[PDB]
């Protein structure tokens, strides 16, 4: 992970520009719904402008900062990978269900996760990663004891530390845990990604049992899916009320979004409040709304 000089940031901006131009293509018919890459990249630029302006006379400080060096490398990588996607996919980028178009939607989500992370570590343009407040007290002491005040750790280090408190049963389960928590897809775990993961899969005391029941063995769960993709996916079940899927909210990171088909032909999405996801799924089953995960006749039991 290299040192960041102003000249590098101007180089990401030129590429981010290149992506915007590609994504302004009328053939894509991109909707405005979150995550919206034509807003996310201008807003990332603007927040990078803000960080830079708070470190006039202190660039040597900013460029040595580890989180920021990793962030900018991943931003170069992701931007370049988006430009390559357009090059290699060509007219398949405009075919609604094509794999290349799906890859663009997942990148759109990753760009959204990167911005939220960048704003959580640099609110107001100054680094505050070493004072980041983890949300679950439980989870908070785990990170302090293992990593002190570090903002970002390599996946391997995170994995080994977690294993000592919450044993991971296998290599394959470890790589599925990775795919879940590593929202920015950069093989590091930030304290912000750790806060998100432990909010979603609380209580910490049964962390990995929760994540196994809700994501690993649950056909309802949908990794890296957007609001629109959830609506389109449930469309094939419009005539099967009680069909439902659930995922991470893009705009409210740390909270769950449940999509379901109603008896009167609506596809609605809801974010549960003052109620863990477990309980909302159990009650939804009892009350008739959440019956058929991904349209399947059989529903996990969560008692």
């Amino acid at each position: 992970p290299g040192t960041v000089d102003k000249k590098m940031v101007e180089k990401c901006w030129k590429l981010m520009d290149k992506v915007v131009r590609l994504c302004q293509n009328p053939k894509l018919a991109l909707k405005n719904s979150p995550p919206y890459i034509l807003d996310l990249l201008p807003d990332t630029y603007q927040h990078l402008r803000t960080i830079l302006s708070r470190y006039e006379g202190k660039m040597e400080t900013l460029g040595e900062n580890e989180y920021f060096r990793v962030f900018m490398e991943n931003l170069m990588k992701k931007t370049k990978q988006t430009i390559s996607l357009f090059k290699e996919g060509k007219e398949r980028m405009y075919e609604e269900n094509s794999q290349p178009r799906r890859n663009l939607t997942k990148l759109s989500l990753i760009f959204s996760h990167m911005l939220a992370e960048l704003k959580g570590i640099f609110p107001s343009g100054l680094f505050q990663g070493d004072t980041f407040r983890i949300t679950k007290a439980d989870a908070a002491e785990f990170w302090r004891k293992a990593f002190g005040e570090k903002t970002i750790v390599p996946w391997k280090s995170f994995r080994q530390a977690l294993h000592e408190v919450h044993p991971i049963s296998s290599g394959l389960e470890a790589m599925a845990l990775k795919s879940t928590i590593d929202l920015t897809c950069n093989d590091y775990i930030s304290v912000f990604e750790f806060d998100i993961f432990t909010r979603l899969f609380q209580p910490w005391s049964s962390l990995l049992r929760n994540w196994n029941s809700l994501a690993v063995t649950h056909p309802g769960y949908m990794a890296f899916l957007t609001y629109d993709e959830v609506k389109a996916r449930l469309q094939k079940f419009i005539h099967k009320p009680g069909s439902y899927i659930f995922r991470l909210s893009c705009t409210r990171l740390g909270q769950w979004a449940i999509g379901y088909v109603t008896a009167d032909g609506n596809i609605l999405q809801t974010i549960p409040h003052n109620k863990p996801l477990f309980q909302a799924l159990i009650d939804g089953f009892r009350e008739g709304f959440y019956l058929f995960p991904d349209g399947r006749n059989q529903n996990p039991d969560l008692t």
Partner: peptide
Amino acid sequence: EYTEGP
């Protein structure tokens, strides 16, 4: 748009 839980 997110709506209230059922």
